[PDB]
Amino acid sequence: GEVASVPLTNYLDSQYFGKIYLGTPPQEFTVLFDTGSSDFWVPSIYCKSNACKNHQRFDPRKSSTFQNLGKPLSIHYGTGSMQGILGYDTVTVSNIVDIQQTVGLSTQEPGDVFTYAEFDGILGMAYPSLASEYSIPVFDNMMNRHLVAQDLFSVYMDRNGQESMLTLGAIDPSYYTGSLHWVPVTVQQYWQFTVDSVTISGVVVACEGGCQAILDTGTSKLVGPSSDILNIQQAIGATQNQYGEFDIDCDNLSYMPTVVFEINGKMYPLTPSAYTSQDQGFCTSGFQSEQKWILGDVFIREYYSVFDRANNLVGLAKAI
């Protein structure tokens, strides 16, 4: 029964990553904590990809606790794919010591996706129903062994890009305003629930009649169906860029409309500032086109999210 805090760092609003140790004695990796997947892995000294050479490599020859499993793991991140082998070893996350944890060791990480990414590996935080065969999610282990105070974790993303925190086994009233609203998980694979509508000024622009949505820390954007997401870009005044993007004048921020998600009868609005990314005097739409909605960091930045595996619920409160 414990509580770990894992301070998140942001690679620019796009990647929220944290440190974990693998092995005996412990090797340090930076992990993207991903509610959109269930598998855990790191690059290995058996990877000769340039993405691997650019990152931290697990050296199993340096770990007394290491145990090859043989079992293979294949995953997709972005347009990129990673090849690896399942192994066991001990993982420390905060003061939480997770023994004998299945971990993937990359053998193959081709392309630029992984190279330029800030994280070395990914730690998956969705249901085991989504994990690879022979792979046991980290949070399931911690739960199975009563390593956590409670069966839940909490994520705060600082908009202000500084104070990001992952909370294992606990809920922290300090990172939100108001009360938390509990949201029942509909389908237990992703962290999925029903959005009732998407509104601008009382007009349903999207998710007419209700819609399925997943809370995804591993996604930077607000992702949805093409048809709906274009009515939102026309509505906020996002024009396609030449590079393929949707641009927004940083100036016009003032008169742009607020997008409101109604979820379980409560409304969750996003102002232009929340959905608008600004890089070097270029502003970008937080909305992106894919049937299901992916509420990524864009939403999480505004909304402290609790994931409840005890009760299988989502709690949401307005972030600080």
Swiss-Prot record:
Alphabetical keyword list: Aspartyl protease, Digestion, Disulfide bond, Hydrolase, Protease, Signal, Zymogen
Gene Ontology terms: biological process: digestion; proteolysis
Transmembrane segments: none
Annotated active site: 34, 216
Keyword check for Amino-acid biosynthesis: no
Resulting phenotype, residue 250 to D: Propeptide is not cleaved
Every Peptidase A1 domain range: 16-317
Protein task: Chymosin is synthesized in the mucosa of the abomasum (fourth stomach) of young (unweaned) ruminants. The enzyme hydrolyzes casein to paracasein.
Protein name (database record): Chymosin
Origin species: Bos taurus
Lineage, top ranks: Eukaryota, Metazoa, Chordata, Craniata, Vertebrata
